């Protein structure tokens, strides 16, 4: 649990997700994206399942990054929702939703969707 | 921005979402689902845009709930991703993602997608 | 099942969705968006469950619109995926996905997600 | 356009998507999934952009499969929404929504989301 997820992961875009698993389920750390209106690190927070199953299933988790730091504000936030798989090629497989603040008139087009896969190399 | 988010919020299912918005952009609270493999409050955390634009744009935000508490463990996690719209009929408009831990053969079906709209009611 | 789907349907944006449901499970028609880079009818096609269960369950269905007609080309496509619920206040409840053609560097942001609920109005 | 997309593709699960691009934008063919309540082929229909851009961007497309054939009915339908990329390693990169028919009471959990990548080998 804690041991697996805690640390540095990298997705297929080159972004760098540096997280610490609390013992109770807390997720805390930072996020630097390779693309988008984004530069340097951003704060992130979320949760994972701290007593996950033994049947060889992944560990369900989820975190969120609001795209504002000491450099820029993108008026957006994405949530990654996924599950952590251990073993030889450990991965965190996710899908995500990026909502950016709009007027009610562009609400229809406020949310992008996607998938990021995170490995340790 | 920080008063308008903070407090109790109810989605279209009857779920109760109690959240505190810090001044940095941090979200903390509890979520209680009306539906699903859930009962009582579950801890939540998220992030939001503490400097949203001043143009009638909503305020982007995310948060996560891992469906484990003292009472049960659904081995799953939801992230909600949307925007907050203040004023007379303030709402929090989300789309969400729920991943449950599955086996590798079952990963293709591990994730539900939906939308929740929250009102102060 | 085939009468209840066929006809004119309006989402929460004012868009008009004219569809014919064949007896095999086929959907044909036109879609006219109230929003976006669109104007006049666009051709649509989809599929539905022509033997939905008899247990109060809705009727699964999908359809696609490529945003090219005689008038303009947004180089993009939406699929709607939901269920039809008959009776007094019949609705078609969708979530949708809109992909626009992008470059490879831009693929991560090529896809919008949303929901549309259709009423006979 | 037509030339690229028309034919046989395979996703990362082993499913077999056999499609024909109309000259106007029509998509027609069959779908055999490796997983899920699915056996043999199912009819599919959809649309792609028939005059796509020249700037090296993908071709936006979308299709739908209702999971009923002469063998079984899964009371579900998925829509794939994505874009076709030509060149050496041609791919159709998609995300999808599988909605299954539910009572209004399980509507919240009626729709799964995912991503399939289709290549020619
Ligand atoms: Cl279990
Ligand atoms: Cl993967
Ligand atoms: Cl600002
Ligand atoms: Cl809405
Ligand atoms: Cl049946
Ligand atoms: Cl709804
Ligand atoms: Cl162009
Ligand atoms: Cl890919
Ligand atoms: Rh258990
Ligand atoms: Rh991929
Ligand atoms: Rh600004
Ligand atoms: Rh809504
Ligand atoms: Rh049946
Ligand atoms: Rh709704
Ligand atoms: Rh053009
Ligand atoms: Rh993948």
Curated annotation (Swiss-Prot), chains A, B, C, D:
Superkingdom in the source lineage: Bacteria
Motif Cell attachment site positions after renumbering to this chain: 47-49
Subcellular location: Secreted
A GO CC annotation given for this chain: extracellular region
Signal in keyword set: yes
Avidin-like domain segment(s): 3-121
Residues reported to bind biotin: 31, 42, 80, 96, 108
One of the record's GO molecular function terms: biotin binding
Annotated keywords: Biotin, Secreted, Signal
Subunit text: Homotetramer.
Role played: The biological function of streptavidin is not known. Forms a strong non-covalent specific complex with biotin (one molecule of biotin per subunit of streptavidin).
Family assignment from sequence similarity: Belongs to the avidin/streptavidin family.
Name of the featured protein: Streptavidin
Taxonomic lineage: Bacteria, Bacillati, Actinomycetota, Actinomycetes, Kitasatosporales
Residues of the full protein shown: 39 to 157 of 183
């Amino acid at each position: 649990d804690q041991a697996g997820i805690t640390g540095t992961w990298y997705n297929q875009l080159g972004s760098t997700f540096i997280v610490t698993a609390g013992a109770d389920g807390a997720l805390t750390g930072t996020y630097e994206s390779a693309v988008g209106n984004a530069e340097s690190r951003y704060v992130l927070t979320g949760r994972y399942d701290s007593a996950p199953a033994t049947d060889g299933s992944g560990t369900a988790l989820g975190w969120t990054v609001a795209w504002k730091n000491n450099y820029r504000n993108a008026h957006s936030a994405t949530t990654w929702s996924g599950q952590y798989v251990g073993g030889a090629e450990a991965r965190i497989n996710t899908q995500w939703l990026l909502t950016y603040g709009t007027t009610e008139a562009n609400a229809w087009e406020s949310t992008l969707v996607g998938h990021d896969t995170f490995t340790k190399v």
